[PDB]
Write a protein that binds this ligand. Structure first.
Ligand SMILES: OC[C@H]1O[C@H](O)[C@H](O)[C@@H](O)[C@@H]1O
Ligand SMILES: [Ca+2]
Length: 586
């Protein structure tokens, strides 16, 4: 383990994080929106699951045009969630339970309702004009409408610019129309961002930050028209000019130094960057401890599988190997370095992992949910569990498009309508995809009980902010799963206990090697830690599947799996349907 600097322990390397989506976790006052008192009341549940830390999605004052990711004030809790004091009390309660607390740092962009933008947009001459990206129209079209400065596509569809009538210029918004991008080229802007979004929260005791689209802060000068890579789209991905831009490391080093100098009590701060995509070299530049940038990052290749590179909402075929390789992108690069990795399958931007990567049928949803838990329990990196993942939550079914809340759905729908027609092949493909891929599959209220109609998320008379998934009626809820010894919840409790007990090789294991990489059913690998060897054999299929242990002898003992502990023949070399096994040799 000496030629493996990545094995140096840190609280944040071996912490299991639980991600809370505040709108959808727990309502304490029957207004249909989750809130901080709700979260506080459920911290014991999170601790009992086995979590070491929580990440709460944005709870700051926000119009909710992107459900919190459009922030109007970094220093004020959205009143519907509570007061600032409620938040400080929540941080303290988390701490007093022996858990760490990270907050979501959303500083590529802010709300157009933020005072910075209200000032910026007020004239062309004000001190904050250049805190955002303002450009004149490229020209005017044949109908007299202003043409945006370039061809860039919003992450939510359509143009990445919005026209301001008052000042007669467009402003850049990679996200929704009310999320203007902050101009990191402006040093005064960067310093104000650090003070408000970072310093305030450090002063109030956070243990770290999850950094929203942290790879987007550096725009290539001139904001040039992007390559026309999609021949059936008006607008084009800005990635070459916005993703991992030339100043991105400079900016992350500066922010890291700010954090180091602002902390008052010497505590260890974790940063996890949602960096989206990066070469292995770029990943190392971000997460090498000696670089003083990020602690770790999320890379999205494993959650991209089965979606077109040109458009997330066009489905494409994939095979198990594609997912194996994409998952391994998270962690293989750290081998023999001072870098660190993340491990996750779900977040508030993703559909449910059982639906995507298991089998959500009534027959297989439990066993395949447990299989995914076996996989994640054994992988190197900081593990994240998303609210409801531990219950084996699945995608919702048969929802009409108008039922979806997500601005990502609404804006993409409207762009397709405009470009291709509502009754088009392009629309049909989109509607097919949303049923599998929409962020909204993550966002239906948390299911605490079988109680009609709100599943214990709120009282029975409340109208939830977003519809319940019918799955609560099918036993996917906290109360029913606690009482079922065979539940996905009780299994996740076991998986986290197993991971912690064997943390040297589960959390810090190295020299990851695939076994039978091409296999369309078997996901198998080994890892090392000094004298120890971990071997995984995981059957992602309803068919029985054979496996071999490389250098198989007598030392390989079965330490964890999803089939009944007393019924499994450890010497057998065929996995049952959806069976997973972790063997450890010493
Ligand atoms: O902040 C803009 C977007 O950034 C990331 O994708 C966030 O995780 C997502 O929820 C948000 O819509
Ligand atoms: Ca509420």
């Amino acid at each position: 383990s000496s030629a493996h600097p990545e094995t140096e322990p840190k609280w944040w390397k071996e912490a299991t994080f639980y991600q809370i989506y505040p709108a959808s976790f727990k309502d304490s006052n029957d207004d249909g929106w989750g809130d901080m008192k709700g979260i506080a009341s459920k911290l014991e549940y999170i601790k009992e699951l086995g979590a070491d830390a929580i990440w709460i999605s944005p709870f700051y004052d926000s119009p909710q045009d992107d459900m919190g990711y459009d922030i109007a004030n970094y220093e004020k809790v959205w009143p519907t969630y509570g007061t600032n004091e409620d938040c400080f009390a929540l941080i303290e309660k988390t701490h007093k339970l022996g858990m760490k607390f990270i907050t979501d740092l959303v500083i590529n962009h802010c709300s157009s309702e933020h005072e910075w933008f209200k000032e910026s947009r007020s004239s062309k001459t004000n001190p904050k004009r250049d805190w955002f990206f303002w450009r004149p129209p490229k020209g005017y079209d044949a109908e007299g409408k202003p043409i945006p400065p370039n061809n860039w596509k919003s992450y939510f569809g359509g143009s990445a610019w919005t026209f301001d009538e008052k000042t007669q210029e467009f402003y850049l918004r990679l996200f929704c129309s009310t999320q203007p991008d902050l101009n990191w080229e402006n040093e005064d802007c960067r310093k104000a961002i650090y003070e408000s979004a970072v310093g305030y929260w450090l002063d109030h005791g956070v243990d770290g930050f999850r950094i929203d689209v942290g790879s987007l802060y550096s725009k290539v000068v001139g904001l040039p028209d992007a390559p026309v890579v999609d021949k059936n789209s008006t607008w084009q991905s800005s990635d070459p000019y916005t993703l991992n831009g030339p100043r991105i490391h400079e900016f992350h080093q500066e922010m890291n130094q700010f954090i180091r100098n602002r902390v008052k009590d010497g505590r260890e701060i974790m940063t996890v960057g949602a960096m989206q995509h990066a070469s292995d070299e770029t990943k190392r530049l971000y997460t090498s401890a000696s670089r003083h940038e990020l602690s770790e990052l999320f890379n999205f290749s494993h959650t991209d599988v089965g979606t077109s590179p040109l458009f997330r909402y066009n489905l494409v075929p994939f095979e198990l190997k594609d997912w194996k390789i994409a998952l391994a992108e998270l962690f293989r690069y750290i081998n023999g370095t001072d870098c660190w990795s993340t491990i996750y399958l779900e977040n508030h931007d993703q559909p449910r992992s059982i639906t995507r990567f298991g089998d959500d049928s009534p027959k297989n949803r439990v066993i395949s949910g447990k299989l995914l838990s076996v996989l994640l329990s054994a992988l190197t990196g900081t593990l994240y569990v998303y609210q409801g993942q531990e219950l084996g939550q699945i995608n919702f079914k048969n929802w009409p498009v108008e039922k979806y809340e997500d601005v990502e759905i609404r804006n993409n729908y409207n762009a397709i309508k405009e470009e291709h027609g509502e009754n088009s092949e392009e629309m049909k493909k989109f509607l097919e995809a949303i049923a599998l891929i929409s962020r909204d599959h993550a966002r239906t209220p948390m299911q605490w009980s079988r109680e009609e109609p709100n599943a214990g998320f709120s009282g029975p008379s409340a109208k939830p902010w977003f519809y319940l998934n019918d799955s609560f009626r099918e036993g996917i809820n906290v109360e029913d799963e606690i009482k079922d010894p065979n539940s996905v919840l009780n299994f996740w409790k076991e998986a986290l206990k197993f991971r912690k007990a064997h943390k040297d090789i589960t959390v810090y294991g190295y020299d990851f090697e695939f076994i039978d990489l091409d296999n369309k059913k078997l996901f198998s690998f080994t890892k090392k830690y000094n004298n120890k060897t971990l071997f995984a054999a995981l059957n992602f299929s309803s068919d029985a599947t054979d496996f071999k242990i490389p250098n198989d002898d007598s030392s390989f003992k079965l330490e964890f799996g999803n089939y009944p502990k007393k019924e499994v023949d450890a010497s057998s070399r065929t996995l049952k349907p959806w069976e997973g096994r972790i063997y450890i040799s010493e």
